[PDB]
């Protein structure tokens, strides 16, 4: 179930994005509703450090690929 | 007193902005000194998460309304 | 001749905004109700001053200015705007829309005198869209 | 006539990407191999759908779009693009490059019919550059030292890899590689490079000199 | 018309270079095999980019440039080079040999269009000699 | 008319070099101060004789000769040198630059008579560059990190100093300084530079941005 | 004829900047003192090179360029600039302001020859404003 | 006396070079005979470790400054 | 036999060069193969101090006389 | 007509070099004695082959070549060399100095035929200077 996917405290972001995109594209949603759902799940899941990282984006991110690129650039190396 | 207003740890930002604008406009300042004071109080009060959110603004915010809009857009949903 | 809105209706609308919030469908319906007749910039400005708090009022002033600027861009993109005229001497400046033009600053009677009905309806629609934006933004 | 790529080659390439990763030189060589003939947007799109995971695939779609947009800007900046024509009626829109134009959506045969060879090679080069970007993004030069027991060719390989796969401009890589050869590369090789009767002005020349005069041990 | 080399053959050759090394007679035989048809500068450049590591690739670029310069000196020493022509307008510059000339940078199709067969065989022999030098130098 | 430098200023500068060393920024600032007006070869030679010890003075004579030779090569490469003239009879020989020409050996008055202002400024710049070389030689950029307690302007000063006073080409200093700002400068400032809505393409712009948005503490 | 500033005054000013900082009113007064006579681009450039550290010097170069660009915009907005002339042949380019024009690069004598007094005072005021900006920014 | 100057067993090389250049330039030699004497004194004095370091110089050193630079580069840190 | 000639631990270099050139020129090699053999025997014989001295030659030595001159210049006086 | 040097004098000089060494003043005097008449390249070459060992002979060949090259540079710097002529057809190449030119290789008679007396004295002085260099270098 896509709506139950959370980014674990120790999980990296690319694994979380892979799992989420897999569960959203392999589901019962229409094809035209996958990108907005993936974006809004990146924003509300993806534990509050990345949540604030996406929130304070000086540019407007309108695609899952752009969000992934931005987060991978500005992520907290740890 | 406007210079004693802090954003509480649990208080939202719109309540803090309302309280601050109320106390600044209902005070003894000249009319031409309210906007700069409100801006500089948004920047130095408004606990360090929002302080850093305003500091790292790719655009220059030159009005309390613009600062409020920016912070409401990029705020950490919690 | 300018007639002010009832302070009783304004008080009821302010309490509605206070209890239900800015985004409830009942609040938007009430605003649409009090936004029925074309209002002068003075009326809408005082209405938003009374019903909205300080910070939402600042946000609303910003949004109203932006929407009025979009309207004026569309107006310079089409000389057949119901606010415009046929000649260049009737072109509508933002000072005339925001009520800042000559003979209008602080005077609602003169405002109602010089303003066009198309000007009034454009100002009103702009204010409604700005209210919607601020309501969607505040919460 | 459109001929699909072998699913056997695609399966082998997918397992290569799965074990070696996106950035290994063997993986890039394999991608260059399967990127030999000019592919139609359908082919490259399905290839990246199969070999890449979901998140790298999203990143790659983004990067491919950006590179194709740069290509279309260069195309409107020069009417002599091998994808363009002489008249204005042959100007190539991004719907035709991404395979979204009329008569192409979902149909590889019609795609192969209407597309130009210049269009195909431009799409292919764009996709290769996008793959390189995403590979560099999915997974520090100034922290690289030559270990006490490490040979010099391994150190040079590691350093050139980290310098070329970094955020430096292209015109700043050679001087940085040289000055890192001189200051890293433990003091025996440091003195070997310092006492060079000739002036070495290229990483290849420094590597050749050091390999010639190195202390066999 | 330009046809690329098979990535399967290139992968097999890369693994051969990886296990046997650069100097084994089997590796040189395999390189001679994949060096049979006259290759365009694009082909040889990408081939050496894939089969060789970074440092051997730098060494090979150096050696290839030196050998091509010797070829161009012999070409200016004899106007009957299979890469040259009879008039002075067909003299071959190093930008045309390394693929850096106009209409060739990054485009293998245009490369194959403007290049001569003598140019191709000279480039190929130069690249083979450079590979031999680098292989003798690396180990 | 030639006027000598004050022995009081020279004594103060000599004691500065004696206590602070050759490489301190205060010492280089003092040298730039006493290198303000264009000096005659006699002045610079005696100045370096007094402020520098014997071995640094030998090194400085060597470096000054090399830099003057580079200047004379550039002068024979361009007949429009402010030291040269239009005809061939005004070409400037190294005997005239080092003060060894006829009518100049040991005589500062005649020196000041025959020398050109362009000659003087070229000699002065050459001597300054030679002093910088010898100071860097008498007593590594890729090892510079911003300390946990160090401010950012101190780190930037140290890094720019070590990068500009090194063996890199002049055209490779700005990219290296930028990429060292990005990878050094402990992860708070690293993330501050990473999340820059604008693209920063100059060390000054990066410094300004970081100074604006830095965490006051 | 160009006369350099005393290295004694420059050393004293550098030590003042070193002990008091960039923003103290005594430091700004000292800078105003050494900014009394109109300086040539060479003078101000070397002065800021000596008194400022590397990073403040980079910031100051940036700010000086921006202020000079504002000056040149005002100059193209008014043909009566004391740096400009009446005809179009006296229009002042940024290469002439920053000392980069022909006959000026590295030569202070030629600089003093070709520059106008209005040019000098504009450059000086621009440099002073840039110093103020950088001082307000550094601390 | 310049011809009696030796580099002590514990003395550094820059001190020895300073002392030697001082004694050679402040002596009765002609000006055109100081550099060759300084070089040949660097080569024969300057205890046998530095003697062998100068002897095995792949380049030809023809100036006291160049010899000093070379020795300072390749000296045995101790 | 030329291929059995080694520079002894205590032997000087000119004696070794004399012995090697004697044995190479008084042998069964063609005249056009003596110089390369003498060079490659200087490089592989001539105990590792001189081997490294010849290896780290900033110039390319392409003649036995040039190698002998270089080694005699930069040899470790002992 | 070419006359060879006496093998008795050459044997005595070889034994002198063997007992006294290369650098003794008596040895240099003896060499100056046997270097009195201008010798052909054949004579000096065989003389140095006999009196010098293998390694000093290699060194001497090197030094002789270098000195002859300096002589040829001075010759191209002055068309009035006693080895040169007035026209360009008498310019002396190093093949003619080292005895490598056409009609001279291995034949001393033809050598003596085509060579100039200025050529002979220049070759002789060059060989003497080269001998001095090698003698100073060997010990």
Swiss-Prot record, chains A, B, H, I:
Taxonomy, superkingdom: Viruses
In this UniProt entry, which residues are annotated as the site Involved in capsid protein dimerization upon acidification?
28, 40
Q: Where in the cell is it found?
A: Virion
The record's function comment reads: Self-associates to form the irregular polyhedron core composed of hexamers and pentamers, that encapsulates the genomic RNA-nucleocapsid complex. Assembles as a tube in vitro. Binds to inositol hexakisphosphate (IP6), which allows the assembly of the polyhedral capsid.
Q: How does it assemble?
A: Homodimer. Homomultimer. Homohexamer.
Q: What name has this protein been given in UniProt? A: Capsid protein p27, alternate cleaved 1
Q: Which organism is it from?
A: Rous sarcoma virus subgroup C (strain Prague) (RSV-Pr-C)
Q: Which gene encodes it?
A: gag
The shown residues of the full protein are: 391 to 468 of 701
């Amino acid at each position: 179930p896509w709506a139950d996917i959370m980014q674990g405290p120790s999980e990296s972001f690319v694994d979380f994005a892979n799992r989420l995109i897999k569960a959203v594209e392999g589901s019962d949603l229409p094809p035209s509703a996958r990108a907005p759902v993936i974006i809004d799940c990146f924003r509300q899941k993806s534990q509050p450090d990345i949540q604030q990282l996406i929130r304070t984006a000086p540019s407007t991110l309108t695609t899952p690929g752009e969000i992934i690129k931005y987060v991978l650039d500005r992520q907290k190396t740890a």
